[PDB]
Design a protein around this ligand. Sequence first.
Ligand SMILES: [Zn+2]
Ligand SMILES: [Zn+2]
Ligand SMILES: [Zn+2]
Lengths: 317, 94, 115, 20, 745, 294
Amino acid sequence: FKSRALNHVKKVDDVTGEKVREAFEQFLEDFSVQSTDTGEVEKVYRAQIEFMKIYDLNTIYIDYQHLSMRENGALAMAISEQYYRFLPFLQKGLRRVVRKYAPELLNTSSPEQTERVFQISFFNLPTVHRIRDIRSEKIGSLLSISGTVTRTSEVRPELYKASFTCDMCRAIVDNVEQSFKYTEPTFCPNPSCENRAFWTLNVTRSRFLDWQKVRIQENANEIPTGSMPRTLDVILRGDSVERAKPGDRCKFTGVEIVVPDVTQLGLPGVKPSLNSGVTGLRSLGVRDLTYKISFLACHVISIGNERDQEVFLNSLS
Amino acid sequence: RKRRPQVKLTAEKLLSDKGLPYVLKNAHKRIRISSKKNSYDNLSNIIQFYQLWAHELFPKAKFKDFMKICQTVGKTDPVLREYRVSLFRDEMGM
Amino acid sequence: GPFFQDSNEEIRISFCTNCKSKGPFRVNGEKTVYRNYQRVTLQEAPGTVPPGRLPRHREVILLADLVDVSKPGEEVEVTGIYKNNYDGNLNAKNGFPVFATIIEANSIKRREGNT
Amino acid sequence: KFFSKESFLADFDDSSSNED
Amino acid sequence: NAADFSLTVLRARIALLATAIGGPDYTSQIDPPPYKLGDDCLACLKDLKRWFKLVDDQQKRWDVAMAVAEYRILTDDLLPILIDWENKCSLAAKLAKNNPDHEEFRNKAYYDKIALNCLQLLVLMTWPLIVTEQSSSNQITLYGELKKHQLVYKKTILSMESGKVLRAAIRLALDVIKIDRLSRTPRDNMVLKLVLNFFRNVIAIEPGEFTINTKKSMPKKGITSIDTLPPNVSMDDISLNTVISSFHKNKVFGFLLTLTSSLSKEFDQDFINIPLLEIMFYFTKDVNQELLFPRTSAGFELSKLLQKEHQMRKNVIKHTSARHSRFGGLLSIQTPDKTRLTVSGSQALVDEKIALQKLDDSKKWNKRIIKKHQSVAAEGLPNSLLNSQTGKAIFFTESNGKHFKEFINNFIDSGFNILLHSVTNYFTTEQDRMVTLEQVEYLLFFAWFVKYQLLRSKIDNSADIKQVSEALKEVTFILVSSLLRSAYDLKNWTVTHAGMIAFNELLNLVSRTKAAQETDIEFIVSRLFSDERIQLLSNLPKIGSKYSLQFMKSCIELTHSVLKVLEQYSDDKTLVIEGKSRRQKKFNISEGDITKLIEEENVDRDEALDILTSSLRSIEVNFQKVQANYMTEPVIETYINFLERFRELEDDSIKKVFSFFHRVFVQAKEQALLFRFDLIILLREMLSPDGLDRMSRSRKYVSQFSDYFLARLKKRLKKSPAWFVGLLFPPLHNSEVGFYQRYGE
Amino acid sequence: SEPLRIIWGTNVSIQECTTNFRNFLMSFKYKFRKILDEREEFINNTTDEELYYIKQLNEMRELGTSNLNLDARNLLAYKQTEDLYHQLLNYPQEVISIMDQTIKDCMVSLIVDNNLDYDLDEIETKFYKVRPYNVGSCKGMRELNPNDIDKLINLKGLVLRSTPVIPDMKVAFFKCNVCDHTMAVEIDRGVIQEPARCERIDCNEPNSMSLIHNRCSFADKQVIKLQETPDFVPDGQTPHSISLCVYDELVDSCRAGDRIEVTGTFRSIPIRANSRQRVLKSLYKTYVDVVHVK
Ligand SMILES: [Zn+2]
Ligand SMILES: [Zn+2]
Ligand SMILES: [Zn+2]
């Protein structure tokens, strides 16, 4: 048998990403701007990390005004212009700071122990956008949208990190990432085996995340004369599921994303399914691909019991 | 079943009217290297005439691939070698 | 060889035990075992939901004795294994790698009275 | 710049004692 | 059904043994459960050693390793035992230091024996996995999954309360060290070798490689990922930053320093000379020395990177159409030979160059480019500078980078010389028996620490270059030159690359010591350039173009160092060199001449006969001959092939390439070597806005060389039109016309 | 000797067109239009001596916008672009690109000519597009014929409904799976120029390409169902509807229910009969690709 070896050390790194990672981790470990009591070094994000360490949370609340104050607005502009490129580097910097300060926080927390899926939320943007103001020139960018939710979906599991087994030699391929369609590995890592299809999913080993798709429309204050309201799908993942109830005036801050037609990508078990889009792809064959504007929100606010003495005095100021 | 041979850069192809005699006829007329122009424009003017000559001669290959197959044919074909020494001998005879 | 059915998705036959390729497959009558199967649409109770909101639907598998125990309109407490399976229609109509959820019921208790 | 082994034992025992 | 039955009974027996080693003591009520040893548990450690001996070693199987790994013996049994022993021994040492002969261990010998056996299993189970040819199919099937389990092992070792097992291992070492040198049995020094081997296993574990089967054709989906990582293990846990943090917190660095600095006076050096070098190599295989000296600052470099990205994005969107995709624009271009060629675009409507780049890019036929298929990974070797990309950067933090800088500085200032002398003592007798791994790690250790001391002496004047003065002995010269020569004659190319790096840094060190002081320097430059080594360094670039990018970059740096160290002797003429004589050099000796030489240089006549013989092979070389030997066409071919990757490289490598192009095209004055068309296409690509940045300092000398190049090109084509053919083809070899082709008569 | 470029099937030079429009936009003052609109008897010369377009282009670099409203009757005014006016009635999609590249080159020449201290990055980053209006007589939706295919027309109508914004790719972003090389390719007429391998020679792995959907750069496309105005309809039939495709800045420039005079090219595309097949029906979908909205 003949085998070809591929190394992970050959991969080209994009140095702007790890410089963003260094700037973000220095922003976490060196912010120290608070007016609580006297003017003192506080490092409020480190205190928030110990707050997670006490209360076993998994999401971080970061104000965007702090990012604008740190390094003349340049780091905030670098995050806001290309959030999708720097998001693994943002997660790596958060993981490095948590490893430096709270080493037990990296695990989920008892034999089963998985990597904690840290979710980064950036709130308090300087401007808010309307659904009518959404353009496709600013996808992958940090945007805030005010709207009213029409209906909300079931809290369903996404396949976040996937593990598969080869049906021939029972080899294990894990950390397969599914962007928008359910994907299986192509090349069997055993050099003796030559399997290409027929991979069986490992339900237990794979790591899942919560999913919710809420559909929003613009508020009646900004609806002009004689127009049907334009709609937008907003994705809530992780801790932010079931936070927004339908019919409320609410602000989502997060990422504008674009989603492809999944049926046109050749999903297993689904027949290929009116506006002409792009084509000329190998996965498309002769078919065309359509695109829809959606949103990937990272933080939600809504702008529209315990009958015992001890818990009420604990909850009191 | 032998149906067709796929075409490559051959000795009869360089010795046609559209080929290296075209280069000897029109390269000194077409190529202009000037000190007033910057080096990008000069180098692109060098590339442009040879790229049009390549797209008239052997349009199947890309231009860097065309230079690679010219290197291979110049290392291989003997008729091209005696033509190349014949050009030099004819110009030093005059 | 005989393979056990998980009552979520059909057993994927990639090859055969003698030939390493797909072929014609039909059920032999040498060893066949049949069990009862019934899906119920378990809607959330309207006194349990928040007032004015929408109910939630999860398909629940009833096997063996559990068939015909539930009735349409009967309020129940189902104690069951909460599994998930891959379907292509949810990924088709949602745009994200989303998995359907299936409750395999181990037991049904009638919720008689206020309890 | 010679590094003494007895200094490493002393530093090991001292950083066992208080660790600074 | 024998194989799966044997596998399941083996897995059952390893499961029973793993339950029989110990338990977390759930009976006692402590908020952290203290680990309690099982009854008759040392016999279980000997049974794991017996299982790893009888099955894994002679029978050529790796089933026992995964049978251990899936039941978490290292994660849940050996590490809590060693950490409990470490904590108990530390508390007992504190209480015995404050008051001696109070609160002893009950069974300290038993605890020391089980700790030693646990460390033996750590070394035996985290051994580096090499799969060469003719190995068993079980190892070939199991190699990737066992590498993943070793990655889990490295993460669990470095992450379990910041690696207290490292403190346990150094405590097991200082159990040996406290004994006097005369009273130490060889078993105690073997325990020291066990500890040093454990540290080399902790450092040396790297992510595996993704191997595919190429018998079947590659489908349209292709390779979707090459990730070879376990679920809980990330790239941050494996990386060197956590290694430096866990080593500095647990004082591994001081342990390595105090064994390196007193290697000859305190320890038997033959036991631990090789694992110490392996440890130093496994630090320094993936660290670039220029990035260790950094010269808001992160935001400063970030702002410059966004400015560079903004300029490149502006140059990209110059080509981008202003309208949408369906806005159809068709353009018909004509040559002065009347023809119509149609292109589709909006930006290509106005300018000719974008339209011609479209017409070049519209073709769907691609030439074959043959690949070496990276056969270095077939040998058992770690990923290093010989395998990593030139643009790969290790991202040290501030504290980790400062601790690594302090450790390397104290290593060079304390015991680089003693360790290097001991290793070149050992390898000069074991030269014909060492496999490629020790040759590669010796040459890389030597080259890395010589280069780091050179860079530190260049940056700061406080450091002394004489701290790597034992690099300049004749024994290391002989060893490095013989390793490079034996690598070349056997056509081994990894050791050739490592020796090329080592020889380049050797020449750089010689040049630095010569520039510092102006002597033994003429003796050593006569020593290195003796024999047929000038022909070796001459024909190394001729064979460079076939191999990888890193080999070709080392060819650049080695040839630049050779020409820089040999251009210093152009006027001084001191080029006496021991040469190889071919035919008869026999001379009838005269004993009167011998005795007057005895009176002259105070010598015995046997070594005067040696001097009289060695004077006969002494020759002199011409530096113009060295240049003219270096000017062969495959050397220009490999340098043009190296300049093709101009996006990835920094300014220094292309500065070296254009300096050699100035050496060819201005100084040597033969210009037909650079009158080839691939250089013209590459110069168009570099001088385009899509290529080199205008703010970069490289484009200045690229533009100057291209200006002088096109000036001489227009001179040659104005004097002779026949060279219009000569740009296309390789240069001609016929002697009747080749003088006119190369020089113009 | 110079390989000049010709608009396809037209025998019209690129260089003649792009010099005629350039010298036009440098040297068109409004008094020549006042001559050739028969408004000589109502001249206001103090608004006529100055350059009509150079002042507007100096205003665009200060306001920050990058869209030039232009009327085509001035092409009848200035002589050198007179035949170019017929190009606007004959071959719109080429010459419109020629005008917007000439506009961007005029910003470049105006910055570098008077030595005004302005950064070239902000000039070259923005995309300039021409917006021609008032090109000719208003045409009816009934009188539209297949002789108007690939021509520039005006329409008068009302908006029935407005779709949400449709993404259209402008640069496709591709990534190698074995070496993480991130490269960019150009979309042309809806087909992706997909590479078979990396541009890097070091890996050059075939079939390793992946499309990163969210890192591609996009543009806007909105389809408007234009309805014929009730003043000019025949008495027998309902007003007809046409597809009206706006792009980029002109998306959401048209509200609902308002009367608009729209300017655009009249194009016909083949509709695809089956979703997974290449078979195209004989009937063609007609849409007005919009270059200006009034
Ligand atoms: Zn397999
Ligand atoms: Zn079969
Ligand atoms: Zn690649």
